[PDB]
Amino acid sequence: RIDPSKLELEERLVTVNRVAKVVKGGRRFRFAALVVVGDKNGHVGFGTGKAQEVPEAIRKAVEDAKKNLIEVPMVGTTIPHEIIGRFGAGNILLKPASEGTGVIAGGPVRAVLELAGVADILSKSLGSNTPINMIRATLQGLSELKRAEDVAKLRGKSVEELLG
Template sequence: MKTALNSNTKEEYPHMASYIDPNQLDLEDRVVAINRVTKVVKGGRRLRFAAIAIVGDKHGHVGFGTGKAQEVPEAIRKAVDDAQKNLIEVPIVGTTIPHEVIGHFGAGEVLLKPAVEGSGVAAGGAVRAVMELAGIVDVTSKSLGRNTPINMIRATMAGLEQLKTKEAVAELRGISATQLQD
């Protein structure tokens, strides 16, 4: 009997995304939010810091992570480490995304639309950071739900995971990519 530890092939586990090694990429990181959080205990309040970070190589790989620690630099380091473990590959067509998509997470919803070349990233805050680090230069976005940074990032990442290339759509339909254009 094979275990998941020694045989992680796509044939055996088609539902699992392939692992992206962060050491082989030239990753850039950006801290999106740092929150001061407290835990009330018998002796008073325990103060800690929670950080949200995004990493990307600006060539179609992006990830996000969270970290919590008693010091800000340690929380940021944990968030960046977590982000490197959660990298995804984003299909890019020219300078934009292949098609329109809506990403959902909790009460947060993000509409991502392809934009013409030269229009730039029309997105705010956390969504802008994800798009820039993914390498998407031209895109329009609209927040449709709650806009807390973590929900916006998770909804954006969910939307980016839904994106499919023209070849992937043709394969799902059982036709060639040239037939899809016709």
Template sequence: MEQRKPRTNNGERKSGPRRNGQRRAPRREEKEFEERVVTINRVTKVVKGGRRMRFAALVVIGDKKGRVGFGTGKANEVPDAIRKACENAKRNVIKVPSIHGTIPHEVTGIYGSGRVFIKPASQGTGIIAGGPVRAVVELAGYSDILSKSLGSRTPINMVRATMEGLASLKTVNEVAELRDKKVEEIFG
């Protein structure tokens, strides 16, 4: 005897695994980067009919293994702005060096009038950084770091200055290679 498929409310035959209104669980793909929303800003444009509001998002992404990036996005709705910022951040990923969970040497990143001073810390110190800087260094994979924000403290300037500083970091091997010397010669 032929097995009959159950009917829906409008008389059509149902097929497949989704009977009685059950839905298949959406596939969760493993994300390459962890995302952190640093700031969401409501911006307005005054037009003839009144004010047009949009949302600007600043997002930092990283894999906590030395790759970090940031991006900005603007849209009429917050989730769209965050999605755009994440897509933009994936295009701006940089690789940063790490030695025992900290940076190889102290560095000052400058963007506009914002300055971020970042200093290596001994193991067990933790991340001593404020807001936007903390998001960047945590997602870069650092566990011990000291930092100080100077000048403009706008979140976008802080993130850009931090990224600028981290991008300029060089390991001892890289410096030795640039100078055509051995690592021992650099330390004298």
């Protein structure tokens, strides 16, 4: 479903890109923005930020962030299993680990996983070093996650039978 706006969003920015456009006179410098937005309890999202200024792009990032959020399973403050997302030439894989392992991730990706609350991820940016698509490389993989009690309900099977 759609995640409601009845939460506590923390919304720290990642990068700012100044982005041009060439008219009869000369250039026109605007700014681009993207802000990873969420709580620390499993809801992550973002939106684009476009303006003619610095701070109003920060404002309009929050709108589509509250229009588009997504939820992640938090089994033991980890991802419950291993997955590899492949959206648009930026491959970023996701590996779970033990609870002491911290958050080892790429630059913009590290400002995503701490905005999940999930603190145990190994990852490695296989694909390109572009900030929009690396975040698209994360949530697309995080969308394809599964829960332990859910797939047993999908299989019509016991949850403990998935473990033993």
